[model samples]
Target: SMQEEDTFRELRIFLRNVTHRLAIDKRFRVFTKPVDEVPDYVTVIKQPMDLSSVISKIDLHKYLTVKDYLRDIDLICSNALEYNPDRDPGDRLIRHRACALRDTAYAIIKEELDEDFEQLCEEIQESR
Candidate 1:
């Protein structure tokens, strides 16, 4: 049974743009991989996500909607803050970097997904 399917091409293009921008930015470097140096990473990060993984998912057409894509972007930042609390130790704030990346992501997403983003938020709020 065939149905009218929305390929979500615009979402994929925007996602690629966001991931590429983050991949090139020096500030977002540490977030690109799960090197063995951080032995606990795989264990702690139940769902590991990064620029590379995000790009892979996009290429694979894994995301179903704009909301779904944002979740992974959120995961990247949330994981960082969750692992390293913003308490300010010698690691005096990987939290800062995470926050910066999050802000960058939202700014880009909102810029590109503007009207649809607003409509989705309104629908979610209205529904609940």
Candidate 2:
């Protein structure tokens, strides 16, 4: 007996858009100095991929808000900041990642997934 089933790929599609717009610029310009080669992990998350699906995608406030998420990130960063005798390398990255996410979240909220990437452009200009 074959019962037709509904596949919820639409949910993934919706999230994909969010990830594509926020996770990486439409032009694929989010980057650093040229790497020796593109690793599988980098390619998987960098382009031709929906990073939002893998990372936490901010949609709405349902028992959670962007600020709440940022605060949790800060908490982890704060722990890393503590004067502990033995903090691992993971703790070091926690602070860097929290700072990075905080800045990106504000930019996304300010520009609302800017089509022209105005916020990012202006940010780079300001850094100059």
Candidate 3:
């Protein structure tokens, strides 16, 4: 159970890092804007939005905690593959299968995580 616990802890740290990076990147994007005016044959408008309040509103601590639980399962699958060696022909075959499964699971998990992150970003944008 210690390995399980450590795996969960690692996942929690990784997810928190991911979330923190997402927040920081969003904050940094707020400062840059073009200075020169262009001819308006075709125009694009970007509304000035405030995200501080929205970021404050998010319960990131709790969100990352929950996200870590989900990520832990994926991490376990990947770790299982990593623990086995590909020294022999049979071992290589098994490793290949495990890696394939791990990759498939990772693809699914990544998609879900990306969608959740995008939703959070959209919520912040709309809250402005």
Candidate 4:
């Protein structure tokens, strides 16, 4: 069905831009790199996800579809929310930032691709 067509290429570029968006946002610096300073991060975040890692995945052509790319975005944000609980005021601040980043990501996809965004969502749902 030539399902791939140019979708993969476009998705790769779009996903890369998503990472770029996060990169330019100062609030997302905490998610741009691995949690090296905090020794417990490894223990807390079972599968760590970061912006740099997402970019590498895009460069490597690791994503099969837009959903894969979005999943990584979710991973990065959810990891931060998991580690930084909302109980404490400082932790709540980081959590809010993570939420904002997550929203920004979806907003970009919906904005950039417009109708194609809806088509991609439908495709992925019926894919497997």
**Candidate 1 per-residue lDDT over residues 5-104, each given as its tens digit:** 2335655776788789988999889887653568888888798888888889998978756677778888988898888864567354677778888889
Which candidate has the highest lDDT of all? 4
TM-score against native, each model: 0.77, 0.29, 0.30, 0.82
Q: Write the per-residue lDDT of candidate 2 for residues 1-128, one digit (tens) a residue.
A: 02111111323343345345544643222221122354553443332212332334333311122333335334333433442224677555544554564456456555653434333333433454
Q: lDDT per model, in order?
A: 0.74, 0.37, 0.41, 0.81
How big is the positional error of residue 63 in model 1, measured in Å on the Cα after superposition? 1.4
Name the better of 1 and 3 by TM-score. 1
The best-first sequence of candidates by TM-score reads: 4, 1, 3, 2
How big is the positional error of residue 58 in model 4, measured in Å on the Cα after superposition? 0.7
- Number of the predicted model whose TM-score against the real structure is largest: 4
Better of 2 and 3 by TM-score: 3
Task: Give candidate 2's whole-model lDDT.
Answer: 0.37
Q: Give the number of colliding residue pairs in candidate 2.
A: 0
Error of 2 at 63 (Å): 6.8
Candidate 1 accuracy as lDDT: 0.74
Which regions of candidate 4 are displaced past 4 Å?
Answer: 1-5, 117-128
Quote the lDDT for 16 in model 1.
88
